[PDB]
Design a protein around this ligand. Structure first.
Ligand SMILES: [Mg+2]
Ligand SMILES: [Mg+2]
Ligand SMILES: [Mg+2]
Ligand SMILES: [Mg+2]
Lengths: 339, 339, 339, 339
């Protein structure tokens, strides 16, 4: 029904990674052959889906765990560069239907900043999408978080280019996987582990002052905010009425509600629940919520038939379906953008 | 306004642990001296609070991390026995105002089952409250989870005595603390880490078939369910439409919604939000929600002035405030129980 | 998906009233030929719909405006008796699928009480359903309301027989139609006028003390309560904080929330909105909400596909779908009643 | 806590109407002596309240029933002119704290249009506020509605001046009072009758095509929309799926949700319910909701302590508290307008 929707948690994989794609599909897809075809296709199947379901524009990004799974920094950087060059050539076929997020090796702040800049300046990419902490160390068992002063040069590049950063999940690996997840492995991914990682990282950015040093920085979370809106009251209470009397105020200058009004966005990817959407509208505001799908892990039909038919006032259907993202990503036009 | 409310996430500490109590208070209280007095008091300050705020009956339990912090199994068991003997003598002063949950060493399923039985049979305790995984191993860096076949003898003791088990959080320790939390330490506790632990453990019980082998087992989570109701739609979708086509059905026979209708309860402890309560009423049902406070980490005033004044239909105010817990814990009477 | 649902705002018309059926259809149906067949059919089409959509049991009632449109008390009484005899015979064909509400002339309290008693004692009808005020006076321009002492004998008959009374709407007529509705006639019926009538009558019963004189009396409103839940806060405030200080307490002894907890029920007839249902669960409580359809003015498909697929906790889906009505109407087994 | 709030359903009365003020107070106030002082005061008591509760700017309007109670068109017009001249002088004392709505006799479309124009062009009034239908006829028993072609000249004046029209309630009178309300008089006013009138009039404007002929017209309803949001689903269904197939489309060209997105506003006057506000954010959108008080029928304390302390995302608190009204009324700076 609604046309010109924008979706922006929409994944692709390189054709040369078919074995890795099938491993990931063995965890998260019930039809591996269709999954392989859909995650690698850019300009045919993906366009047919969007045409049937009123999706005018999609910002594509690399599948998880992606470059964050690569703990060799030279290999990781070369892979990020390869992916960005590849998707730039692919989306030129349909520029009124596709944009792309930069794919990044996050081993080094300046290296990541330079590649983000190359993507934005050379290819017009719309921002960055990163799958939660970079694997590093001898066997990839270390994690690189971005919520510290070493990453200021990177976050300042984001605000200078004025593009958002999408904190996507990745799977638990190594020591963390063995200790917490191996004995309850069906919880890996969307059921629980994904949100635990993203919420930890983003609230780390909050409590380590990233949005104080970079007040213009825009951060996006999928899956209606990875549990965080559920605890908006509880986090705010334990920040303002407890931890900010014990030292947190030294590195965290605004309330959690301020940061959601000024810096943080949430997306409807993989969470097609009108009851939860309404609750998020109360706790974060319809202005800060964007439609997305999580294709091809979710189907266009599930996401779009939900949203198109959800009971919702017309003002917020427009905002969530396209107008919020249209302003955030400075979209002058695209297919059906004002339909 | 409402009298005879029941609260059941209400903590005490032994007087001999003052140093440990002050360490915990240095993380989670803004007034250490009042905290020490309140967490150790049973029959004076705690009764004065309850009298002012319409709380007829409280089920007391041992402060976190409690016995789960003790990785010496002999020491841990002796401490659990000591705590249960102590609180039994304390609550006999005011039997129409206080019951108690068993405090347990969870190093060994049969040992824990026997001590739960002793508490219920000898002292009339109302169930068990355990602070998420037992520390074990050489330096307490291992975790004992209860979502496996070794714990069947324990869960069968719970269903035979027909008493619930409250899965309370504890702090992250050791390797997990260093890897995920040390660099964002203000998130430890109520802001995030507590819910991550409890939700992992309870959903582990779900996906490892604990409620299939023990369909009468009642499990309680505080803090409006430790994020889980937020993802009810998403978990249900990724169980029924994804993982249960890939192997999860082998150890998980009902839907997540079934388990919340039949086995799982949530509590309002430390989450005094009517907007979130309404959302939980939609996602889990008012029948499955219990009032609680989280005293003395939360104040009676915050919890009770919220609940007493919250906009709510009279049917559900009665149920959540006392009648749900009255039926669950088989309370024939207590102060103001039918006021 | 849910089987054994109960619906109880389901209308029929006498075959000999085809012209009245067609006039009403010309206001409220977009397929008059199907409507005529469906509103007169009891045991074939209506059963086929119920079998397809998991409706085990239906309490049937006479179409609006029905006997309340008849201002000749002799003609009105004879028609009520005719209708009750007719539907008693019809429902005997499928007694495990159908019950009936009494149809009443409400010109005289004792006469109406006697015919309700005959319906319950002779035919086992489940209650009464009445289309708002009884037209009266020489030209049918007066209105008989039931919220006064003259009707105590009638309400005492309801409580003695322990059966509920369903306050259904009727169209505005005569002077009221001319002054308020004739110049905006598209608002007649479900869009506005229906709820204005029923809410006036039920809140009249509240404020004139009917539920104080008859504390066991159960009153049912369709259409999620005819706007009243939206104003529960506002009515409660303007009663307890205003009118109850000015004289209302003389004839109204409990709060509006008390009466919804103790006396008033709402159904989902013609209001297939999960967002509004959730709000009603907050304002009135799931224990007080009953599934219903409003057939043949609404379709089985619209009502049942909505309810069966609505995002709802399993506890409340069971209560609203059938268990609330099973208890209220003291129902024996019926088709799929325990499925 | 929030400063610079805007309220715009704030009433005054002329000093020479003490008897009318006292009769109205005898229906709607529990402290008539304070009410008389507060409803006549402009520049002292009312300012003190606003200073204490963070209300920067108020648009003032004449008390109900006001000029709509006057069925002599000559007396009605003279009184409207008197009131507008009076309040223009009063608000000049504190022009950074007060604006005014036009008070109008609505006996004649051209006359009302001319007085609205005088108010805007001579005094800079912000719009019009009218208490539902104009009493008319020899004994005041007729009602003038504005949802017809005779009023096109008036609505065209609203859009030409680009100012909104606030449809405020009035009490039921004459035959309507006798037939519907006299025997249940405690429902008169906020409990029920007020909303019945306004919702009828506004939905009449919808279904008689006023917003089709005048697509720029902005209409404001108090009291969270006078029940209409509760039935948004039901009205929309009975328009688009029923009446629009039977002839309504001839005079009503968009959906009810379109008109709430494009033409209709609601305020929080006299409805200090976060639960209902959240529901209204789902059904109408936070962009279309305005803070207001309904002083002196409601207190500043009730309205502002509710709103300032309600659990709400920061984006919508800002919009509802002041930014929506700042844009709608094109307001220059006022006290704390950017605080
Ligand atoms: Mg994704
Ligand atoms: Mg606790
Ligand atoms: Mg009906
Ligand atoms: Mg007013």
């Amino acid at each position: 029904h609604m046309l010109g929707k924008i979706a922006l948690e929409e994944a692709f994989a390189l054709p040369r990674f078919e074995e890795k794609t099938r491993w990931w599909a063995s965890l998260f897809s019930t039809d591996a052959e269709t999954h392989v075809k859909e995650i690698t296709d850019i300009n045919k199947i993906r366009i047919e889906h969007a045409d049937k379901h009123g999706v005018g524009y999609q910002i594509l990004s690399y599948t998880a765990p992606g470059v964050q799974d690569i703990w060799d920094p030279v290999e990781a950087q070369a892979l990020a560069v390869e992916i960005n060059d590849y998707i730039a050539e692919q989306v030129r076929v349909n520029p009124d239907r596709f944009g792309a997020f930069a794919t990044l090796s996050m081993h080094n702040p300046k290296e990541a900043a330079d590649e983000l800049r190359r993507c934005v300046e050379k290819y017009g990419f719309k921002g960055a999408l990163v799958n939660d902490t970079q694997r590093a160390g001898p066997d990839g068992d270390d994690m690189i978080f971005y919520d510290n002063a070493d990453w200021d040069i990177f976050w300042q590049t984001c605000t200078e280019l004025d593009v958002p950063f999408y904190m996507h999940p990745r799977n638990p690996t190594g020591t963390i996987y063995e200790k917490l997840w191996a004995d309850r492995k069906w919880l890996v991914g969307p059921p629980l582990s994904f949100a635990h990682g993203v919420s930890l990282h983003v609230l780390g950015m909050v409590t380590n002052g990233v949005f104080d040093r970079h007040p213009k920085l825009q951060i996006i979370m999928g899956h209606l905010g990875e549990h965080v809106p559920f605890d908006m009251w509880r986090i705010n209470h334990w920040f303002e009425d407890r931890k900010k009397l014990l030292g947190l105020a030294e590195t965290c200058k605004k309330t959690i509600r301020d940061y959601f009004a000024e810096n943080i966005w949430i997306t409807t990817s993989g969470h097609f629940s009108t009851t939860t959407l309404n609750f998020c509208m109360a706790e974060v505001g319809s202005d800060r919520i964007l439609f997305s799908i999580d294709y091809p892990f979710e189907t266009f039909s599930d996401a779009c038939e939900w949203f198109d038919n959800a009971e919702l006032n017309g003002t917020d259907r427009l905002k969530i379906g396209r107008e919020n993202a249209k302003k955030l990503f400075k979209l002058d036009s695209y297919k059906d953008s004002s339909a």
